[PDB]
């Protein structure tokens, strides 16, 4: 369920779940999939910043 929610909130910033995750692990970040989806549904600003951090880490 979480994966499906994170994959839908990652296509809005012209990105893919597979790519987003790949770059999120290359920047040394330890976060659960249940927490990532919980942040996307709530404070959207936080998620937006996270995408940028995993976008320049590629």
């Amino acid at each position: 369920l979480w994966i499906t929610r994170i994959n839908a909130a990652a296509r809005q910033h012209e990105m893919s779940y597979s790519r987003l995750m790949n770059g999120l692990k290359k920047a040394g970040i330890d976060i659960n999939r249940k927490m990532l989806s919980e942040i996307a549904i709530s404070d959207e600003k936080a998620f937006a910043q996270l995408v940028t951090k995993a976008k320049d880490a590629l």
Binding site: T4, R5, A8
Partner: peptide, 9 residues
Amino acid sequence: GKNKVTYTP
């Protein structure tokens, strides 16, 4: 509705 962040099955 598989394009929303609040999609429930």
